[PDB]
Amino acid sequence: GAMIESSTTIQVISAGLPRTGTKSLKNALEIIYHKPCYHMFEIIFNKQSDIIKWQNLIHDSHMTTKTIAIYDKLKELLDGYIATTDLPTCGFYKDLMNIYPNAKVLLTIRDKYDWLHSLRKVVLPKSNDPWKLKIEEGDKVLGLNSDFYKLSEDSLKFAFQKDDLNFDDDQVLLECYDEYNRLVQETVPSDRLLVLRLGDGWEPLCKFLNVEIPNGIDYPCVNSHHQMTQLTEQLIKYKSLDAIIHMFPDLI
């Protein structure tokens, strides 16, 4: 197909929750558009200064005139990106739809129990889980402090629309997961939505986006809980990111 000059603006809004293939999608979108895609990894590795901006945004977003102030902040944060995935953005998908009226919406989904088990190993271990101590240690090596965890928890609460949330309760999380995914499919016009099951790969995505399947490039498969466990252990061992970054080429 012909090469065309794509606009550097948000073209794709992904509503999928963490641990649903969002980093693979981020990588795939960057392969298609040759511009960056937002993801929690963007905050952790490139823009930790964004953390307080997202926290402020979530704080203001329970609240027209104040709507515009928030929408402007949302635009500032996403400037120069061509897509959004993952926390903290995914909870804002309805607002992003208004701000970027020509952007299409994706929903990444998977088996709810596989999701919960992935989440527990990586994002939200039970507070009695000894692994949680390793996660906290690896996080410190990356320079992630209490404000990062606050942003993580608050943006999940915001996505699930729940003033508080027993994070140690599987049944609660499973119910929020199903309800969240259900509400996305109800809220977004089917013309504007593509639902992607883990493992679907390039074809339905590229069709939806009217682009050619990348030549000879397999659809990304990254950010497994096994890989994140290795990253955590390596961070603990070497006490820096830069010491090991060459060992995780596509992941980061």
Ligand X SMILES: Nc1ncnc2c1ncn2[C@@H]1O[C@H](COP(=O)(O)O)[C@@H](OP(=O)(O)O)[C@H]1O
Ligand Y SMILES: CC(C)NC[C@@H]1CCc2cc(CO)c([N+](=O)[O-])cc2N1
Give me the least distance between CB of 89 and ligand X, in Å please: 12
E strand or H helix that includes residue 68: helix 65-77
Q: Verify binding: residue 132, ligand X, rule CB under 6 A.
A: no
- 154-183: which residues touch ligand X (CB under 6 A)? none
Give me the least distance between CB of 92 and ligand X, in Å please: 17
Q: Rounded distance, CA 66 to CA 252, Å?
A: 36
List the structure tokens of 111: 């088996």
Q: Which of 114, 168, 169, 203 binds ligand X (CB under 6 A)?
A: 114
Give me the least distance between CB of 217 and ligand X, in Å please: 12
- Residues 32 and 214 sit within 8 Å (Cβ to Cβ): yes
CA 113 from chain center: how many Å? 19
Q: Rounded distance, CA 249 to CA 252, Å?
A: 6
Give me the least distance between CB of 3 and ligand X, in Å please: 26
Q: Verify binding: residue 22, ligand X, rule CB under 6 A.
A: yes
Q: Write down the H helix ranges in 123-224.
A: 131-141, 146-159, 170-187, 202-208
Q: Interface with ligand Y by CB under 6 A: which residues? A: 18, 40, 86-87, 122-123, 135, 138-139, 152, 228, 231-232, 235
The entry of ligand Y, ligand X, none that residue 24 binds, CB within 5 to 8 Å by partner kind: ligand X
The entry of ligand Y, ligand X, none that residue 225 binds, CB within 5 to 8 Å by partner kind: ligand X
Question: How many binding residues for ligand X (CB under 6 A)?
Answer: 16
The entry of ligand X, ligand Y, none that residue 198 binds, CB within 5 to 8 Å by partner kind: ligand X
Query: Which of these, 26, 78, 8, 83, lies nearest to 250 by C-alpha position?
Result: 26
The entry of ligand Y, ligand X, none that residue 235 binds, CB within 5 to 8 Å by partner kind: ligand Y
- 209-248: which residues touch ligand X (CB under 6 A)? 219, 221, 223-225
Q: Is 216 exposed, middle or buried (CB count within 10 Å of its CB: 0-12, 13-18, 19+)?
A: exposed
Query: Which of these, 98, 112, 122, 117, lies nearest to 40 by C-alpha position?
Result: 122
Give the residues lining the site for ligand X (CB under 6 A).
Answer: 18-24, 114, 118, 198-199, 219, 221, 223-225
